[PDB]
Ligand binder design. Structure first.
Ligand SMILES: CC(C)(C)c1cccc(CN[C@H]2CS(=O)(=O)C[C@@H](Cc3ccc4[nH]cc(CC(F)F)c4c3)[C@@H]2O)c1
Length: 376
């Protein structure tokens, strides 16, 4: 039964997608950010100006202190805390309880968001990137070990937000058309390989290893599509050329300035689609996912800006590889098939579209080139 797991995610634009979890005995309810880009389960466990509730260890009779400190520095934001174990459940997920590692966050810097409505983070990637080191078993590994739940999960993130995390199986009600799979190159992040990028159907014509310098990952905790410097600059130039009819603030393309139009007058049609071709499961085959401006120009929720419709450019520069974040994942049904070491993409029920264009997953595409596109 996955019907009860449907629509178990909530969120605000730019502030991630969260699921309700409980920790401790008796259970304490907390909202937890779903993040495929990390591997630590961590919850606020001390007062913070931006937390309206937190994990109170002294009130759980099943809490065990591991007497070990832990620190996680993200690209933006960091926290410090104390490791322990306790019982964890997902009320609107699988009907199981597991004992898992939990980092009790005691200090933090730019981690919690004012008004985000979540109080913790669930890192769904592999032990390789867990802190303090890879010996700290991640939540999903514990869940599979301790229960009969199949080793996979899927995410349907929906734009303005909500969505579904389905654990243990595939919900065919959440997508249409074909599911296309790209291999997980290595299990640490969910690392994948991009073999080609097009803007409105025009090839960026780079050596395809540049697209994966120095890795490409699928990362639900990150809002933006992040691209390696060289690829970012070229994509921005290509996108600028398409939307040349309208001029925008210099800081817009830097993600430092919003662009606003009168309510309901956003000129979506002047902006190009972006296609990412992902390595297929068969030699020299790929498939493409196509992203509309409704995805990469993300609406800002702030009430202060609500007189018009304002958007932030949700593509940004990366020094640590490509990050296919939420704006890439939104509208797609994304299957993290850990058992078969692959990630699947299909058009979801909440996929982005207007009358002329639609987000799509299409294939196969074939290349004569014999160069692998993985970096290093
Ligand atoms: C493995 C680890 C050491 C955690 C690490 C270090 C650098 C980069 C990564 C890749 N994954 C990262 C990329 S990121 O830092 O942009 C967002 C991060 C999750 C994260 C962390 C704090 C956060 N605070 C607010 C948000 C909401 C977000 F949507 F803006 C948020 C999301 C991912 O988890 C992992």
């Amino acid at each position: 039964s996955f019907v009860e797991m449907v629509d178990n995610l909530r969120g605000k634009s730019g502030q991630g997608y969260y699921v309700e979890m409980t920790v401790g005995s008796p259970p304490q309810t907390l909202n937890i950010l779903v993040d495929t880009g990390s591997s630590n389960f961590a919850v606020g466990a001390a007062p913070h100006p931006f937390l309206h509730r937190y994990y109170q260890r002294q009130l759980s009779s099943t809490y065990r202190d591991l007497r070990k400190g832990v620190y996680v520095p993200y690209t933006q934001g960091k926290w410090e805390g104390e490791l322990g174990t306790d019982l964890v459940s997902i009320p609107h997920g699988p009907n199981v309880t597991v004992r898992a590692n939990i980092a009790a966050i005691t200090e933090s810097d730019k981690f919690f968001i004012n008004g985000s409505n979540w109080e913790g983070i669930l890192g769904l990637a592999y032990a390789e990137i867990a802190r303090p080191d890879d010996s700290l078993e991640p939540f999903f590994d514990s869940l599979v070990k301790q229960t009969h739940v199949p080793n996979l999960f899927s995410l349907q993130l929906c734009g303005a937000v909500g969505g579904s995390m389905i654990i243990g199986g595939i919900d065919h009600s959440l997508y249409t058309g074909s599911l296309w799979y790209t291999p997980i190159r290595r299990e640490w992040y969910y690392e994948v390989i991009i073999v080609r990028v097009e803007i409105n159907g025009q090839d960026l014509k780079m050596d395809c290893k540049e697209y994966n310098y120095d890795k490409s990952i699928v990362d639900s905790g990150t809002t933006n599509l992040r691209l390696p410097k060289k690829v970012f600059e070229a994509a921005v130039k290509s996108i600028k050329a398409a939307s040349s009819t309208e001029k925008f603030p210099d800081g817009f393309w830097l993600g430092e300035q919003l662009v606003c139009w009168q309510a309901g007058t956003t000129p979506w049609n002047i902006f190009p689609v972006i296609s990412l071709y992902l390595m297929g499961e068969v030699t020299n085959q790929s498939f493409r996912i196509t992203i509309l401006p409704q995805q990469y120009l993300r609406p800002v929720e702030d009430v202060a800006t609500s007189q018009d419709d304002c958007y932030k450019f949700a593509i940004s520069q990366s020094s640590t590889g490509t990050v296919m974040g939420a704006v890439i994942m939104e509208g797609f049904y994304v299957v993290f098939d850990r058992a078969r070491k692959r990630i699947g993409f299909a058009v979801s029920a909440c996929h982005v579209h207007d009358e002329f264009r639609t987000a799509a997953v299409e294939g196969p595409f074939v290349t004569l080139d014999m160069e692998d596109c993985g970096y290093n």
